[PDB]
Amino acid sequence: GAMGSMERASLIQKAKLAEQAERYEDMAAFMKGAVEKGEELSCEERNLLSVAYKNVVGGQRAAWRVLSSIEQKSNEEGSEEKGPEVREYREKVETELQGVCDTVLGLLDSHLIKEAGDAESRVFYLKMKGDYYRYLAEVATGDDKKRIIDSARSAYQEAMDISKKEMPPTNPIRLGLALNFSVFHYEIANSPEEAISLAKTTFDEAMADLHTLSEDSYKDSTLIMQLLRDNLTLWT
Amino acid sequence: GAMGSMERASLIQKAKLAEQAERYEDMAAFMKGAVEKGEELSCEERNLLSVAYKNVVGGQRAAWRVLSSIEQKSNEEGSEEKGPEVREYREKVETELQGVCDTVLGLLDSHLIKEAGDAESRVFYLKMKGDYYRYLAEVATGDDKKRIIDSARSAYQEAMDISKKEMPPTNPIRLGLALNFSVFHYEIANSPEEAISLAKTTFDEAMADLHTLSEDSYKDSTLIMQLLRDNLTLWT
Amino acid sequence: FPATV
Amino acid sequence: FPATV
Numbered sequence: 347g348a349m350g351s352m353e354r355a356s357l358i359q360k361a362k363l364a365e366q367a368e369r370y371e372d373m374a375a376f377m378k379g380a381v382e383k384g385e386e387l388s389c390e391e392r393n394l395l396s397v398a399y400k401n402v403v404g405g406q407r408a409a410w411r412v413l414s415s416i417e418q419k420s421n422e423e424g425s426e427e428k429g430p431e432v433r434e435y436r437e438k439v440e441t442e443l444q445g446v447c448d449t450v451l452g453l454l455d456s457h458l459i460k461e462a463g464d465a466e467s468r469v470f471y472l473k474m475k476g477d478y479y480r481y482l483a484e485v486a487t488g489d490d491k492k493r494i495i496d497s498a499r500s501a502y503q504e505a506m507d508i509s510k511k512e513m514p515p516t517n518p519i520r521l522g523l524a525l526n527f528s529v530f531h532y533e534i535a536n537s538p539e540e541a542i543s544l545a546k547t548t549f550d551e552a553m554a555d556l557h558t559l560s561e562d563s564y565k566d567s568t569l570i571m572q573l574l575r576d577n578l579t580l581w582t
Numbered sequence: 583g584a585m586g587s588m589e590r591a592s593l594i595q596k597a598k599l600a601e602q603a604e605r606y607e608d609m610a611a612f613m614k615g616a617v618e619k620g621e622e623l624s625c626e627e628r629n630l631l632s633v634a635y636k637n638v639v640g641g642q643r644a645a646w647r648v649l650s651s652i653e654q655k656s657n658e659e660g661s662e663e664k665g666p667e668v669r670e671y672r673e674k675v676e677t678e679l680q681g682v683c684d685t686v687l688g689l690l691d692s693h694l695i696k697e698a699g700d701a702e703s704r705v706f707y708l709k710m711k712g713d714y715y716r717y718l719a720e721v722a723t724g725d726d727k728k729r730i731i732d733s734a735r736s737a738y739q740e741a742m743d744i745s746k747k748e749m750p751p752t753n754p755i756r757l758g759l760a761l762n763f764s765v766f767h768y769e770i771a772n773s774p775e776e777a778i779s780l781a782k783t784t785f786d787e788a789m790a791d792l793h794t795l796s797e798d799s800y801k802d803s804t805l806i807m808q809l810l811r812d813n814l815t816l817w818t
Numbered sequence: 819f820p821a822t823v
Numbered sequence: 824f825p826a827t828v
């Protein structure tokens with residue numbers, strides 16, 4: 347750990363600075379260093395961790411999609427052979443993406459999830475675990491693809507079970523978990539009907555609980571509800 | 583050189599792929615590998631090199647500015663001491679920026695400039711040399727700042743002298759060189775009047791030569807002329 | 819692509 | 824910031 351000599355508090359401070367500078371690779375490295383101090387993460391710290399790696403892997407995924415698109419075209423009937431370079435470079439980006447996912451999954455397994463007892467932390471981390479297995483699933487093609495998919499499903503399912511028992515239906519973590527598990531169903535598990543059912547039921551149960559919220563909590567919940575509706579509009 | 587085992591043509595192909603994927607660090611690494619094959623660069627290849635490193639250093643510069651701004655505020659009268667972290671992280675980004683600049687300047691010195699005999703290549707590379715010394719100047723504060731500034735000035739001046747002898751006033755390389763040397767005068771050399779004079783004279787000499795151009799060359803030249811006018815509007 | 823958070 | 828290319 348190249349961050350082993352830096353104070354935990356300094357790592358968190360620098361993660362916030364890296365965010366302001368839109369230096370998300372640095373942000374992720376600082377937050378990995380903070381996790382490796384071994385202490386549990388506060389709510390703010392968990393979100394710094396998730397923001398950092400979401401931005402890093404999001405860029406990798408966007409690049410992979412561009413390259414995969416170019417690669418598939420080079421393989422159509424009538425394309426001029428261009429050699430191994432597109433495949434090689436897609437593989438390079440894919441391997442770096444898998445590395446980032448494995449890093450995040452490693453942090454969750456050593457030892458964030460096992461120490462997470464409160465619903466807000468445990469559901470958050472299990473959602474992340476589902477998310478990063480989902481990103482691995484997006485690029486998987488081998489003997490392991492079904493097992494990667496089932497790892498994502500299992501993490502999301504455990505998070506869902508806890509969230510339904512322990513959080514109100516408007517809790518933004520619960521909502522974001524359902525949003526993403528719904529996308530998993532649609533895009534990974536070839537289960538569009540499950541995706542649509544989950545998004546719709548989540549939206550309706552949240553709507554009925556909005557009356558309990560403050561203005562600020564209302565804004566947070568309705569933002570994610572709008573994403574659920576956006577996806578439903580995309581899919582119907 | 584980690585690219586030493588890859589074919590020159592494969593490096594150029596992958597640079598173009600990296601560009602499409604907005605992976606500019608990769609793009610720059612591929613083009614550095616291509617330069618290190620030792621052959622001169624074609625027009626397209628020179629622009630791949632410049633696009634890659636301009637994007638990399640541009641992001642570093644934007645980050646440095648954010649962090650420098652935060653640092654200066656932390657040093658105002660009334661600010662709460664936050665410790666060494668802002669300075670340290672600004673220094674980290676600054677050192678990485680200086681490294682990229684030194685890398686580019688190294689490629690130009692070994693041995694792109696000395697092999698560049700045609701005006702279009704030689705002016706292009708000397709403009710780059712001015713640009714990357716200018717980026718070093720932006721962060722310089724020590725015993726070397728004046729010498730860094732004079733290195734930028736000298737490279738720009740040699741490029742200007744060649745461009746005025748060997749290129750028409752509408753040549754986009756000549757125009758972009760003048761644009762950037764004008765910014766050097768305004769932002770680095772504390773010579774706003776020289777900056778304004780150079781931009782205005784460049785614009786007017788180009789305007790008078792537009793009648794010689796094809797529609798496509800006209801579009802290229804007038805685009806950079808509009809940047810000259812934009813800066814003049816900013817400065818007057 | 820669909821929205822995720 | 825001013826324009827450069």
Ligand SMILES: N=C(N)c1cc(-c2cccc(NC(=O)[C@]3(Oc4ccc(Cl)cc4)CC[C@@H](N)CC3)c2)cs1
Pocket residue numbers: 365389390393394397470473518519521522523569570823
């Ligand atoms: N970036 C930072 N420095 C910090 C961010 C936070 C912080 C703390 C609690 C919730 C949030 N919500 C979000 O990020 C957003 O909603 C989420 C995110 C994650 C989940 Cl599972 C659920 C909902 C806001 C709305 C956006 N469309 C999507 C992200 C941020 C503390 S610090």
Ligand SMILES: N=C(N)c1cc(-c2cccc(NC(=O)[C@]3(Oc4ccc(Cl)cc4)CC[C@@H](N)CC3)c2)cs1
Pocket residue numbers: 601625626629630633706709754755757758759805806828
């Ligand atoms: N990105 C790629 N794959 C490639 C780009 C090129 C290529 C070749 C010749 C000129 C250009 N001009 C430019 O880039 C732009 O003008 C310049 C750039 C550099 C100079 Cl010194 C002068 C003018 C177009 C207009 C933009 N506002 C600023 C950049 C690009 C070949 S390949």
